Write a protein that binds this DNA or RNA. Structure first.
Lengths: 131, 163, 97, 66, 88, 68
RNA sequence: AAACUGGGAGACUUGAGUGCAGAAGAGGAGAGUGGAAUUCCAUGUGUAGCGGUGAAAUGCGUAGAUAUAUGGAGGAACACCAGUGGCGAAGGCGGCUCUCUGGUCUGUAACUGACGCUGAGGCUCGAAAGCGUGGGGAGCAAACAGGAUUAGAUACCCUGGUAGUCCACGCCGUAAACGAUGAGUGCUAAGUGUUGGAGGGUUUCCGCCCUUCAGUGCUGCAGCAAACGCAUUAAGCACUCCGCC
């Protein structure tokens, strides 16, 4: 049975990225929509459109490719897992790939990037690394 | 692409190997050579060749070694970020280092690293130590190094926005 | 509901034409006394056989058509009486649908 | 090669119509495969039960030489 | 094993509203009828190990639905388990 | 393992042993023999002397003693 | 402070179950029954061999063998069908009829409203051989006897032959018990066979084309692997829980 919908979302993105085609659909959720917006703001996704009929979903993602069809996201990783949770303090916020990648952190004032958190000096649960 | 072999290149032997083939009667013996090639400015290639004597072998290997070359980016004598290169049972981790610290790296990987002009870097081999596969894994890990400009170009951003 | 069967037996060839009626009526009765609604009973044909059964190479075929609830002790009574007779040679009881 | 039980739309087999059954047995009495007769997978199961039923009730020979 | 008239006979008295085939009352009552009949069959045919598997799986299903009913409404639970005659 | 299996039953490593075990000794004077007192050397009295022949493929007569 | 994990009051239908309408099957337990063949028995005809091997011999036979014809008695296994077919959690399950009974698949959209997954300790089942009590005993056959072969042959080969192999009830609890591949769930090119269903078209389509569920095989891409290889039935990409090095 499904136990980690955030990990399922991340693996859909990675699986459809590696085979290099240009759409993807998932059942919706308040957290996945948050990280879809964060993925859109930084430049990994091209767009995101919200359909909704009679159950939770859905969310459509439009991937993005280089000028010679090379990939802008190269991998993607789930950090906190149901079974071993990872909490970070305001001075422990991580810097993935020397700033060339982002981390995603949930705090008392939103689900935000790792820059926006070490500018506010808070910490929380660590969702993912995307580099 | 092809970095074409038209430069000032300082080669280096990394290994040799007495290799046989049993035939009717007795035994044949050749010599296999492993060589690196570079200019200590950021272009490094490896190549191997075999012959019946050691000079002929090392020659054919430098011949082979020059046909391949990699770009090896860096940001002031230090690799841009941290990579792990894996190729068939050889795992090699590489980290950015501090200014004037040197190269702390093992036998095969330090040849590769020094002939590309790397000055300050730390390494470790979490794998097997067969020279060929160590060299191949190291080159496999340099190819993952990303420039700061290219990332800013691929995304819709500028630099000094993501650093 | 009920279940439907088809009983098919083989009478001895060399009997007369009154013991035959006696036998047919006898088994109709002893089917019905246990709550087995008989709904057809006919003669079929006189045939020779593809091998001799006891010493006989002909026999007269008779078929009946009967329903009953699946638990009634009727259709086993037919078996228990038929394998001890002297004019019947074989029988096959079979669920019909 | 067409399934002759599908030629007509025949629903029941009845193990009694030894005229229909007699075309699925060889010239010695043995059952013929699903290939040499081109019938289906389940009609073959029904036909086999039919002729096994027939042989017991003395409508059909087990072996036939004498 | 129960017929299709016994089944509707006993789901027309543990229903709550009309059209009520769900509702863990209905399910544990019908499962109880099944487990009784299968216990009879096992006593008669006690080396039918392949039907005992199904018996045990029915028992597991009923115990699970009972746990659910209890954890959400104790009143319905007590009233049922009085009405149906179990909880030894 | 899952980290729940690890929490139920932790990791255990191997135990190392010397190759000079008769050099962690204890007296036999008042009660018994005590093992805490790792020594660099011990002394004794030789109860025999002589020679012996080595393994394969060496060849000699190597001098030795037995000591209490 | 209030995003996430935990607690409390609610609400929902996609997971999970139930109802209604259908389908396939060597799934299991009990009780009867059929034909082919082997053995022994009875009777007729019948003359000197039969049987067996790389060659022979032991064995059976002129108290009439083998062969051949007709009749009886008993036991065990089910030819053709039969198929990389079907069913079962595994061990396993093949003649036929009836009685009692477990699970799976497909459509629908009445219903309940997260009732789910995994599972240390514990229980249940578990090929063959073996053990106990009482039956049965045709063929085969450890042990054993006799004949051969060899340097020897407490073997392989031939003639015999006891437990056992079979039934009822108890015990045992192990196998290369194997796909040497734990269970649940989602995602990731294509091509081609076959088993059981459901839809649309042309419509004697009931034989053909297309779509779609669940099984079962072959080839092959990304990716993985130390190579062999695996590849929507993963040994790929990921999360949960157990067993083990």
């Amino acid at each position: 049975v499904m136990t980690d919908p955030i990990a399922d979302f991340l693996t859909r993105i990675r699986n459809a990225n590696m085979v290099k085609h240009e759409t993807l659909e998932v059942p919706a959720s308040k957290i996945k929509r948050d990280i879809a917006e964060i993925l859109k703001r930084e430049g990994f996704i091209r767009d995101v459109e919200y359909i909704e009929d009679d159950k939770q979903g859905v969310i459509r993602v439009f991937l993005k490719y280089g000028k010679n069809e090379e990939r802008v996201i190269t991998n993607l990783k789930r950090i906190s897992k149901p079974g071993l949770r990872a909490y970070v303090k305001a001075d422990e916020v991580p810097k993935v790939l020397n700033g060339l990648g982002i981390a995603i952190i949930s705090t008392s004032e939103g689900v935000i990037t790792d820059k926006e958190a070490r500018a506010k000096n808070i910490g929380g649960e660590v969702i993912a690394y995307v580099w | 692409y092809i970095d074409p072999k038209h430069l000032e290149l300082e080669d280096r032997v990394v290994a040799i190997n007495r290799v046989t083939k049993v035939v009717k009667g007795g035994r044949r013996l050749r010599f296999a050579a492993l060589v690196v090639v570079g200019d200590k400015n950021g272009h490094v290639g490896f190549g191997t060749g075999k012959a019946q004597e050691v000079p002929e072998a090392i020659r054919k290997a430098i011949e082979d070694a020059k046909k391949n070359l990699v770009e090896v980016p860096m940001v002031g004598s230090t690799i841009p970020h941290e990579v792990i290169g894996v190729f068939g049972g050889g795992r090699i981790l590489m980290k950015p280092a501090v200014e004037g610290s040197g190269v702390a790296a093992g036998g095969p990987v330090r040849a590769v690293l020094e002939l590309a002009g790397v000055a300050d870097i730390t390494s470790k081999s979490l794998g097997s130590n067969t020279p060929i596969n160590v060299v191949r894994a190291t080159v496999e890990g340099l190819k993952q190094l990303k420039r700061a400009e290219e990332v800013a170009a691929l995304r819709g951003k500028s630099v000094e926005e993501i650093i | 509901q009920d279940t439907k069967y088809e009983i098919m037996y083989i009478i001895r060839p060399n009997i007369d034409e009154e013991a035959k009626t006696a036998l047919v009526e006898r088994f109709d009765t002893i089917l019905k006394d246990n709550g087995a609604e008989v709904i057809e009973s006919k003669d079929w044909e006189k045939r020779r056989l593809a091998y001799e059964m006891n010493g006989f190479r002909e026999g007269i075929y008779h078929i009946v058509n009967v329903t009953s609830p699946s638990t009634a002790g009727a259709i086993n009574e037919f078996d228990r009486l038929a394998k001890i007779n002297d004019d019947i040679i074989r029988h096959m009881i079979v669920k019909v649908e | 090669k067409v399934d002759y039980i599908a030629a007509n739309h025949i629903e029941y087999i009845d193990y009694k119509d030894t005229e229909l059954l007699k075309r699925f047995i060889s010239e010695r009495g043995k059952i013929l495969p699903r290939r040499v007769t081109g019938t289906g997978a389940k009609n073959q199961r029904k036909l086999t039960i039919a002729i096994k039923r027939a042989r017991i009730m003395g409508l059909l020979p087990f072996v036939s030489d004498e | 094993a129960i017929s299709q008239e016994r089944k509707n006979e006993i789901i027309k008295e543990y229903a709550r509203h009309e059209g009520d085939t769900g509702s863990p009352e209905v399910q544990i009552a019908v499962l109880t009828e099944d487990i009784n009949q299968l216990n009879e069959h096992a006593r008669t045919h006690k080396k039918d190990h392949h039907s005992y598997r199904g018996l045990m799986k029915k028992i597991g299903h009923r115990r699970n639905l009972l746990a659910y009913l209890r954890k959400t409404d104790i009143q319905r639970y007590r009233e049922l388990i009085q009405r149906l005659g179990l909880r030894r | 393992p899952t980290i729940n299996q690890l929490v139920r039953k932790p990791r255990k490593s191997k135990v190392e042993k010397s190759d000079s075990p008769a050099l962690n000794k204890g007296y036999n004077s008042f009660k018994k023999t005590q093992t805490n007192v790792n020594s660099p050397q011990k002394r004794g009295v030789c109860t025999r002397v002589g020679t012996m022949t080595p393994k394969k493929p060496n060849s000699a007569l190597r001098k030795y003693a037995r000591v209490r």
